[PDB]
Amino acid sequence: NKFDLPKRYQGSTKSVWVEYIQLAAQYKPLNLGQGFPDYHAPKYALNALAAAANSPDPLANQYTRGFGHPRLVQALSKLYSQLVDRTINPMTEVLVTVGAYEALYATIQGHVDEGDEVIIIEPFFDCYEPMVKAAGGIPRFIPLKPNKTGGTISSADWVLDNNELEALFNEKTKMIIINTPHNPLGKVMDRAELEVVANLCKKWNVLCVSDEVYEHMVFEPFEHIRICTLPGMWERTITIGSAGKTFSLTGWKIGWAYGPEALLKNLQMVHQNCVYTCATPIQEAIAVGFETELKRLKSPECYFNSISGELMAKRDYMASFLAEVGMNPTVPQGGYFMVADWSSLDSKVDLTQETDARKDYRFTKWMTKSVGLQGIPPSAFYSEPNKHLGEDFVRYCFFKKDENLQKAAEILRKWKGSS
Amino acid sequence: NKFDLPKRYQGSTKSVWVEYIQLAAQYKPLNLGQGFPDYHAPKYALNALAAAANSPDPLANQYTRGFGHPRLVQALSKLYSQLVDRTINPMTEVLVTVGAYEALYATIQGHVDEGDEVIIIEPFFDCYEPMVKAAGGIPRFIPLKPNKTGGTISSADWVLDNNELEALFNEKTKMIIINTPHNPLGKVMDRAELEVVANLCKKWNVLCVSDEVYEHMVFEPFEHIRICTLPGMWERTITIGSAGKTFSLTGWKIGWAYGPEALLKNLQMVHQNCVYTCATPIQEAIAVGFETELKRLKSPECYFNSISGELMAKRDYMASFLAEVGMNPTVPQGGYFMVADWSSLDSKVDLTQETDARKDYRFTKWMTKSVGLQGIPPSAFYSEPNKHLGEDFVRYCFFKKDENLQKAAEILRKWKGSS
Ligand SMILES: Cc1ncc(COP(=O)(O)O)c(CN[C@@H](CCC(N)=O)C(=O)O)c1O
Numbered sequence: 013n014k015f016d017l018p019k020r021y022q023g024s025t026k027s028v029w030v031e032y033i034q035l036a037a038q039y040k041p042l043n044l045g046q047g048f049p050d051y052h053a054p055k056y057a058l059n060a061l062a063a064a065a066n067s068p069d070p071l072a073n074q075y076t077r078g079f080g081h082p083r084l085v086q087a088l089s090k091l092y093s094q095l096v097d098r099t100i101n102p103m104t105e106v107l108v109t110v111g112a113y114e115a116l117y118a119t120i121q122g123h124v125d126e127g128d129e130v131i132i133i134e135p136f137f138d139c140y141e142p143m144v145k146a147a148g149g150i151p152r153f154i155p156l157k158p159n160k161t162g163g164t165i166s167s168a169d170w171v172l173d174n175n176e177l178e179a180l181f182n183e184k185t186k187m188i189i190i191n192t193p194h195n196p197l198g199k200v201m202d203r204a205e206l207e208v209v210a211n212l213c214k215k216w217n218v219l220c221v222s223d224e225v226y227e228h229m230v231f232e233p234f235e236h237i238r239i240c241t242l243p244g245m246w247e248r249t250i251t252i253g254s255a256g257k258t259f260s261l262t263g264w265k266i267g268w269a270y271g272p273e274a275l276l277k278n279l280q281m282v283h284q285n286c287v288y289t290c291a292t293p294i295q296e297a298i299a300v301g302f303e304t305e306l307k308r309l310k311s312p313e314c315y316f317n318s319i320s321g322e323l324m325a326k327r328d329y330m331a332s333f334l335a336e337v338g339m340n341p342t343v344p345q346g347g348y349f350m351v352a353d354w355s356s357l358d359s360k361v362d363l364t365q366e367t368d369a370r371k372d373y374r375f376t377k378w379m380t381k382s383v384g385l386q387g388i389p390p391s392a393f394y395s396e397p398n399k400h401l402g403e404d405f406v407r408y409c410f411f412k413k414d415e416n417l418q419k420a421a422e423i424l425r426k427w428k429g430s431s
Numbered sequence: 432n433k434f435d436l437p438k439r440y441q442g443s444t445k446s447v448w449v450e451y452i453q454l455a456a457q458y459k460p461l462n463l464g465q466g467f468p469d470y471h472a473p474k475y476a477l478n479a480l481a482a483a484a485n486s487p488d489p490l491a492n493q494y495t496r497g498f499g500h501p502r503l504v505q506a507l508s509k510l511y512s513q514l515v516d517r518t519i520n521p522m523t524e525v526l527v528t529v530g531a532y533e534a535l536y537a538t539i540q541g542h543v544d545e546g547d548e549v550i551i552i553e554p555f556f557d558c559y560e561p562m563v564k565a566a567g568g569i570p571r572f573i574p575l576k577p578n579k580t581g582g583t584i585s586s587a588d589w590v591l592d593n594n595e596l597e598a599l600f601n602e603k604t605k606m607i608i609i610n611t612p613h614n615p616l617g618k619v620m621d622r623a624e625l626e627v628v629a630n631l632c633k634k635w636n637v638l639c640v641s642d643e644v645y646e647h648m649v650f651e652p653f654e655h656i657r658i659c660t661l662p663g664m665w666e667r668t669i670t671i672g673s674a675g676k677t678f679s680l681t682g683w684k685i686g687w688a689y690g691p692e693a694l695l696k697n698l699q700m701v702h703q704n705c706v707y708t709c710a711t712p713i714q715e716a717i718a719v720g721f722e723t724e725l726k727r728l729k730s731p732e733c734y735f736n737s738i739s740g741e742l743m744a745k746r747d748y749m750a751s752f753l754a755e756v757g758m759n760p761t762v763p764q765g766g767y768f769m770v771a772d773w774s775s776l777d778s779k780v781d782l783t784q785e786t787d788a789r790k791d792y793r794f795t796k797w798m799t800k801s802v803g804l805q806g807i808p809p810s811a812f813y814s815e816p817n818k819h820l821g822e823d824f825v826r827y828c829f830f831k832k833d834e835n836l837q838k839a840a841e842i843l844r845k846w847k848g849s850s
């Protein structure tokens with residue numbers, strides 16, 4: 013009856029996101045932090061939500077099926093069945109969730125017990141660690157590190173030490189979480205890299221959880237490969253996606269996990285007594301969205317195909333202006349984020365009035381308040397022992413109107429050499 | 432690497448809800464089961480969702496603030512500040528969630544540690560027990576029991592044994608969950624009943640969680656009273672609502688917890704790493720719905736004021752045809768569910784084809800597949816040892832078009848022998 017946090021949440025603090033969203037509302041900077049477009053998503057999707065709101069069907073805005081709206085799961089199985097080349101059962105092998113967030117939540121709560129080890133690759137999407145810890149698991153970390161220095165490098169250059177990775181696998185290893193395309197780097201794992209992970213999972217009987225929200229956003233000449241597609245991997249993989257990312261409608265918060273029925277049963281049990289069901293007219297609108305794209309999967313007008321081309325130009329413009337101004341950027345193989353090492357610009361920043369412990373927090377806060385440009389501190393994506401690996405970096409989002417990417421460039425040009 | 436359920440979820444089965452929704456899609460009965468309307472909700476709310484989908488603001492459909500969309504938390508604080516007669520800080524004292532479901536989830540995960548005792552009042556909304564058990568908590572049950580037999584009783588007649596209740600409270604008691612107006616019975620707790628609980632919560636330093644989802648649906652001459660409003664109770668209460676119940680848009684799945692900052696901090700830590708944030712356009716629409724009602728709170732055509740008379744005509748009709756066919760109905764003080772005793776018609780049913788443990792599951796099951804009319808087996812809402820109090824009963828929803836209520840009666844008559 014002390015109403016302290018229960019032990020499993022012991023020492024929990026507010027996430028980066030709660031802190032930096034609040035920082036954005038307060039200073040109103042050019043917001044290149046959290047990932048979302050600053051322009052309209054596909055009209056066919058927005059139209060479908062207005063249509064569901066306006067539907068003459070009285071069931072359109074009432075409860076739908078708890079493991080997912082029938083029309084959506086059917087659309088999801090149609091698409092992914094083609095992509096993974098097996099027939100995925102829409103009732104048993106798909107679970108619709110509240111964003112990729114709740115799919116990750118239901119997966120971790122579903123398969124992580126007290127003392128189970130979970131391997132996490134740093135830098136990691138930040139929720140992975142607190143979710144494992146809340147489920148009583150023991151995270152085991154391995155960092156990706158660049159094998160090139162100075163100038164602009166590629167996210168391909170950020171690599172695991174495979175001996176170090178092998179070393180982490182033992183009889184206590186329950187799960188490994190991989191994220192490709194990767195947040196924050198943009199790294200897309202190639203077939204050899206997936207093979208390394210898959211071979212260890214098979215040897216050690218571990219569950220692979222593949223966070224693939226950015227699956228449609230890989231840039232030529234690279235290619236998204238699905239690990240559940242590797243030999244023997246289907247039986248031991250759960251794969252996650254997000255309609256917020258697939259359709260660029262981040263405020264809709266609908267995602268999914270797919271995989272064999274045996275593994276999904278555990279997620280269903282968590283899901284059913286966490287939220288139970290997800291928004292009907294939103295899932296309906298997403299279902300129409302998938303139906304729309306399913307008719308044209310190899311067309312240049314298909315949003316799955318067009319987004320990379322849309323994004324690649326903006327990636328190239330930001331990499332250029334970040335290099336121009338003095339940072340060392342990592343050019344992502346997919347996605348809409350880019351990390352840059354800003355440390356060579358340490359003389360143009362006074363971080364003296366900044367209060368927190370981590371340098372990249374001080375840098376990003378200072379830039380927000382002082383110059384009106386918001387990025388995200390990458391040390392948020394590292395375990396405490398390795399936070400130093402992130403401190404010289406900044407993550408920016410380039411999913412923006414060209415006019416706003418130019419605005420960021422000009423802020424940076426003015427800040428630099430206007431000494 | 433047995434990927435069996437974790438120890439937290441060991442007992443776990445599919446909920447009444449995953450089972451009955453599936454039942455319902457399969458046999459396509461007159462669905463008097465899950466609580467939702469048969470017809471459309473107020474048009475102003477539906478219109479506001481269409482407007483958010485169609486918005487010129489590109490951020491209308493992108494991520495919003497994780498603890499609650501600002502327009503919505505503002506409208507909630509404006510409403511509840513007036514209802515509870517205090518100033519509720521919209522930023523720190525309101526949390527928006529994926530339905531009342533995730534409000535209960537974050538509350539129980541946030542405040543129940545291993546070994547904590549949680550007292551639950553039977554019959555109970557079904558998620559309470561599995562949530563407590565998932566949090567490592569120990570559920571402690573007490574049934575409401577009718578103090579009258581024969582005919583049509585009132586939900587006021589279902590009452591707790593005061594000494595049973597007092598004995599349940601010990602220094603291991605962390606929490607009590609109360610639900611008023613109550614599901615499935617429709618009981619509205621009077622002031623003395625809320626005083627009993629209040630005085631025990633203060634004595635034993637326990638957190639009261641008040642599930643008030645049906646807050647606006649109390650029938651004359653009864654009154655919804657909020658326990659957080661009793662002396663000394665604000666500091667020890669979390670109260671929960673649902674937009675899905677407030678605006679009869681059950682597929683929108685947005686609810687909230689409000690109470691003191693100290694207590695909501697715990698739910699914030701769970702929420703930030705469970706779903707993170709909720710749907711933007713749905714929260715925007717609900718905020719517009721609240722602003723609309725806030726301009727006319729004292730007027731009869733305010734939906735918070737009008738829904739009671741709308742539902743009361745239906746309540747009275749159902750109560751009357753249930754009694755005519757020879758059921759013993761409990762007339763609810765509030766809400767849109769009615770529980771009735773179907774024992775005195777056991778003769779006239781064949782449960783000999785149904786396979787489940789509980790007599791009332793076999794019944795709901797019979798009537799659905801065989802006579803085209805589904806409700807909910809009230810055993811679902813009892814602890815294993817007490818399920819027997821739920822086995823003579825059946826719960827129906829009367830939030831249905833007048834003509835379907837007239838049809839549902841007919842089905843009952845055609846099966847009983849009232850033609
Ligand atoms: C790798 C990865 N995995 C899961 C997710 C979550 O997807 P939802 O469908 O929105 O729940 C994300 C999205 N992360 C975005 C936004 C983070 C946030 N908390 O809003 C980002 O990193 O900026 C992500 O980037």
Ligand SMILES: Cc1ncc(COP(=O)(O)O)c(CN[C@@H](CCC(N)=O)C(=O)O)c1O
Nearest residue numbers: 448465466530531532556614644673675686
């Ligand atoms: C007492 C009570 N508390 C919470 C809730 C959940 O509210 P949301 O806002 O839809 O999450 C309910 C809803 N009860 C409904 C719905 C059952 C279900 N959807 O699992 C019922 O019992 O028929 C309820 O009846």
